[PDB]
Design an enzyme around this catalytic site. Structure first.
Site, PDB file in Angstrom:
ATOM      1  N   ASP B  19       1.099  -1.221   0.142  1.00 28.23           N
ATOM      2  CA  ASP B  19       0.226  -0.035  -0.033  1.00 28.23           C
ATOM      3  C   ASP B  19       0.778   1.309  -0.063  1.00 28.23           C
ATOM      4  OD1 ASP B  19      -1.732  -1.931   0.375  1.00 28.23           O
ATOM      5  OD2 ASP B  19      -2.740  -1.162   2.246  1.00 28.23           O
ATOM      6  N   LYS B  76      -8.397   0.483  -4.454  1.00 33.97           N
ATOM      7  CA  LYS B  76      -9.515  -0.178  -4.017  1.00 33.97           C
ATOM      8  C   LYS B  76     -10.591   0.545  -4.317  1.00 33.97           C
ATOM      9  CE  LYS B  76      -7.073  -1.810   0.204  1.00 33.97           C
ATOM     10  NZ  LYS B  76      -7.279  -3.061   0.877  1.00 33.97           N
ATOM     11  N   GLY B 230      -0.001  -3.439   4.073  1.00 36.58           N
ATOM     12  CA  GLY B 230      -0.250  -1.929   4.159  1.00 36.58           C
ATOM     13  C   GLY B 230       0.436  -1.048   5.183  1.00 36.58           C
TER      14      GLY B 230
HETATM   15  C1  LIG Z   1      -6.537  -4.216   0.861  1.00 34.14           C
HETATM   16  C2  LIG Z   1      -5.344  -3.726   1.428  1.00 34.14           C
HETATM   17  N1  LIG Z   1      -4.340  -3.663   0.416  1.00 34.14           N
HETATM   18  C3  LIG Z   1      -4.624  -4.959   2.321  1.00 34.14           C
HETATM   19  O1  LIG Z   1      -4.543  -5.811   1.989  1.00 34.14           O
HETATM   20  C4  LIG Z   1      -4.786  -4.461   4.002  1.00 34.14           C
HETATM   21  C5  LIG Z   1      -3.818  -5.246   4.483  1.00 34.14           C
HETATM   22  O2  LIG Z   1      -3.908  -5.164   5.987  1.00 34.14           O
HETATM   23  P1  LIG Z   1      -2.700  -3.970   6.657  1.00 34.14           P
HETATM   24  O3  LIG Z   1      -2.825  -4.564   8.093  1.00 34.14           O
HETATM   25  O4  LIG Z   1      -2.780  -2.773   6.402  1.00 34.14           O
HETATM   26  O5  LIG Z   1      -1.211  -4.836   6.140  1.00 34.14           O
END
Ligand SMILES: *C[C@H](N)C(=O)/C=C/OP(=O)(O)O
Ligand SMILES: *C[C@H](N)C(=O)/C=C/OP(=O)(O)O
Ligand SMILES: *C[C@H](N)C(=O)/C=C/OP(=O)(O)O
Ligand SMILES: *C[C@H](N)C(=O)/C=C/OP(=O)(O)O
Ligand SMILES: *C[C@H](N)C(=O)/C=C/OP(=O)(O)O
EC number: 4.3.3.6
Lengths: 271, 270, 272, 271, 270
Positions: B19, B76, B230
């Site tokens: 992310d 998203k 993320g």
């Molecule tokens: C939808 C988003 N890219 C995702 O997969 C969230 C992951 O969880 P996180 O705890 O932020 O790594």
């Protein structure tokens, strides 16, 4: 031609438009300049009513007159559910539509306004087909989803849009002998149910309302098959109203054009 | 063709998707060796902390991230919000994540992803969920986990549930598969395709709570094809080196010596 | 082209027909002379099964052969649900259809027969569209309502007919994007749901069964949209089966002709 | 026929007694005692309750024998929802069909679509909402369900009083409140308004269920019914020929207690 | 004679009764055209806001208000507190409101109002309550509403309940009135008197939450004889003009043009 069908025809002229909540003449002119098909005059937008509490009533006639004299597009105003005297006052101001509105404080828990006793058209809210038809039988000339006003969250409006349209679609193929029971289970007047089955759609204009925050939200409602949208808090509670208002008008006009939706959404600011 | 989108997503097998919130982050992720980036305005840990309605990001900031990297760019859309997905496709990104971290837009229906040209990612918690997402058109599946917490426990539960049921399905008496599909509330034909393949018919990534290189390698050893991260990176002290450390851990998930090297002195996790 | 398509096509020939339960070659001859499109060979009719109790299984191959030799119309026989060996035995006898029947004692509480492993077509029962579609995917070439067998009371068959056809009509007009969730909630295979949506009907022949006692009952099922009816107890547990068998055949043939329905109902003797 | 023509046919039964009969012999007694119609069935409600078993439309043959045996109108029962039983009865050439709950229910969720037929239907009810739903489906005549086959008028009195009571509530009701009242009755709004305008049920309204004595029959008339059904009370008593005349006279002279005494005196064993 | 007190209260038909706390307010209310004033030390909205035990007002301040106006002067006594009512009568006021806005003094019994020379007002929520108050000696009835909130909804419920049951009673089969009186737990003879009159046997005012001229006119169109207003006036910006506006709205409750005039620019309600 019946006086109700004339009222139904008046609301058909808003087909394809955006109705914006406004609190002063300046906001009203911005809404008209952006292309709103009508403005909803009120003294507190739905997101403020939720955040503040207290009793929310019909707006002061003076402020509604100011908005009425500041724009040439139709002016609506809210009356409390069941408050037929508030509706009498609004009608005597010479506005064009009354919204018998669940965002104001309920005045009658058991009965709505008898809308056939009025000359000018009413909008009412609904969550399902049965509610919509009951409001229409009472004389509503136009129906909006209730949604969830003041949240900027589209989830309830989507649910209501899908409930109403989905039961309409069920109604079209249904064995006629089964429509009596279906009307009983909706607690809806049978003749309006058959009228709805004959048309394949709601017998009045159906707008989406509650939580429409972004151009994509507005076009989604239209692709789900609404005739237009209400936007209240999502425009002026944002950082850039005069541009976001235009973007939402553009999104309703061209709701099946993703290239258009991209352009009007680009760098539009915080919602 | 669905099989073209499914094959496209296979290029991500073995990678980390990160992310990002700006072109600076997007380059770091590409430098560390990420296989793709997930553009958004608010990382999942800040969504849980601040609240409010979380939607598709501004097309403008997505364009900036797209122009800043060569690796595929995902974004998203809210669950059920097929018009947000129409806009994302029209921007020209590579993948849409129909994401549970954003505010739900339709409680009863997901997006009809077969109406789209570009591939979708969807989350899941069990094999029935995965299969229903795939039948809707998801070209790639991630575990739902528990986004924003830095806690791996729900992702482990979901990985083990999906793989455990696939392993049960592989050896199941054929005659019992009809009832199994009913109990999964999953389409029978995709269930048999899964039984015949012996694995999920699309790429399967882990997501939700991956905070450390050891978490990432654990997901791989449990049988995932890759991982999303993320908040775990850009809610920590040094993201530039923690990002490379997670990339290394996924590429070398069976080498304990390598995991020690990339974990050593790594600083402070979220 | 597919072998399942061939079995589905084969059962099309029963459209507009009455299938009668029989327990001996004499009852079978009566059923054929009255115009039945097929007979269902069993050792106890559903009303006797219901009244007597005990375990009810596949009939003796000997009595099934006697019925097969007594008529030229197709012959069906019941196997217990999940008893794929009873079905192997019936297939080996050379009958034309197997009914995996809830009227016999359940043999497997969790699984039906894997009907695609068999060469001859199966009939299965249902109470709703999800059941129907699950039976079809398992390989049923033909579907009947469950009704309430052995009672002479059509109320449950009417409920099941209206439930299946009602959901089919809902499905026909449904927004495509909502059909995935609809399939989830039916616990039915999505591809069969979409096939049903495209046809506007069930992908296989759909009969009414359970409690059909009078010509009026049979014609009512046809007007509710069925392709034919099963009658077990209604005919041979009554005063004059040979005349009542004729009347129900004629009622299904002439289901929309009230003058004919009066004619065949008139002076028909005591019903079950 | 038009609905009003069917409503008009049932109106000429005002002030009459309808008697259940099982043969031409019972049929002539009923006509000679002054019944306004006979109800052809193969088992009276007191025997259906006792013996159980599925109760269906009678054999066309026996209905025809009764139709030839008398000149007064002939009615027959069809099971609820069994529209094919009703197609057969109509094709036999009788005058009314009773979609009757004393036969075995054939469709738990829907009644016959009675507008699809030429001949008038009677339907039962326990309250005004039920009555109006049957009327909207096309019934041209309503009877209280009462409790058939018991000789006990308590349920019939409850139903008569409930229907008539809610009709009386309608008369002075605020017009604005009638929409909610229609919702609560699960009844179509226009038949509620029609009932409000007439001050009575829009169709003939008979009492049925447990009428066993002349006093019971006159009581139903004094509570404001247009007539009564009697099944079990007559031919499940000691002298049916004399009890039948006594009940006919009680309905014709329901407000003359001297007459009510004369026809009750030495009447024999009630059921 | 009860009928003398009942006839006295008919002089108020068509009027507004205003809660006042001093001679200044009392004159304003009289100037605006109020038909009576209700003297008290704490308006209902302040009672709900501050709490504490709320009792009969000081005789002294009631005397001041009495000497300051010519219109009738009412005062509140706690429910069941017949000695507070004895004192109010001895002051020489015109009406006692046995009031639910004050702290209840007797949970099980109201004042025996027939022991008094001057007329009483009592609240109610339904026809049975009204009739029981009247049999106790109330010469006038108001809806209870929900005092202090500015919210009309409970007053509308109570008005509609009383009038709806009176309309049902008017057309009811005579033989069914005995059971109806039992279910109302109301005295049968007053029930038949109500049935014969076709309306409440005493003056019936609306009270509780009347905040605007439109609320006042709504109560009148629902069939009330007048309205009480306490907090709605003297918890707002300009009470002197809002008071006259409510008086006008009650006098002209069927003229929408008049309601617009008195509502226009009226300021800010409580
Ligand atoms: C939808 C988003 N890219 C995702 O997969 C969230 C992951 O969880 P996180 O705890 O932020 O790594
Ligand atoms: C009745 C009002 N104009 C309305 O419909 C509000 C909509 O909801 P919002 O979330 O404020 O746009
Ligand atoms: C399987 C059996 N032949 C059947 O279809 C059911 C018959 O029920 P019935 O109620 O006896 O007609
Ligand atoms: C339909 C039947 N003829 C009827 O109306 C009721 C008769 O009941 P009973 O209690 O036998 O008089
Ligand atoms: C008893 C007092 N005079 C009264 O009637 C209270 C009215 O309620 P409010 O909300 O203060 O107008």
């Amino acid at each position: 031609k019946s006086p109700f069908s004339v009222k139904v025809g008046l609301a058909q002229m808003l087909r394809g438009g955006v109705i914006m909540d406004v609190v002063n003449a300046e906001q009203a002119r911005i809404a008209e300049e952006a292309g709103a098909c009508a403005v909803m005059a009120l003294e507190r937008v739905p997101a403020d009513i939720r955040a503040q509490g207290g009793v929310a009533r019909m707006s002061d006639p003076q402020m509604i007159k100011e908005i009425k004299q500041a724009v040439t597009i139709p002016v609506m105003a809210k009356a409390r559910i069941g408050h037929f005297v508030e509706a009498q006052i609004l009608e005597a101001i010479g506005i064009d539509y009354i919204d018998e509105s669940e965002v104001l404080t309920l005045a009658d828990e058991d009965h709505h306004i008898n809308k056939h006793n009025f000359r000018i058209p009413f909008v009412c809210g609904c969550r399902n087909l049965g509610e919509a038809l009951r409001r229409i039988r009472e004389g509503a000339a136009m129906i909006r989803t209730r949604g969830e006003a003041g949240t900027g969250n589209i989830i309830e409006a989507v649910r209501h849009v899908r409930s109403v349209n989905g039961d309409i679609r069920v109604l079209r193929n249904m064995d006629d002998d089964e429509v009596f029971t279906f009307a009983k289970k909706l607690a809806a007047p049978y003749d309006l149910v058959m009228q709805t089955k004959q048309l394949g759609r709601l017998p009045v204009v159906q707008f989406a309302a509650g939580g429409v925050a972004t151009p994509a939200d507005a076009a989604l409602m239209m692709q789900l098959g609404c005739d237009g949208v209400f936007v209240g808090s999502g425009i002026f509670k944002s950082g850039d109203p005069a541009r976001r208002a235009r973007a939402i008008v553009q999104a309703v006009t061209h709701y099946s054009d993703p290239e258009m939706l991209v352009e009007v959404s680009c760098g539009l600011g915080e919602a």
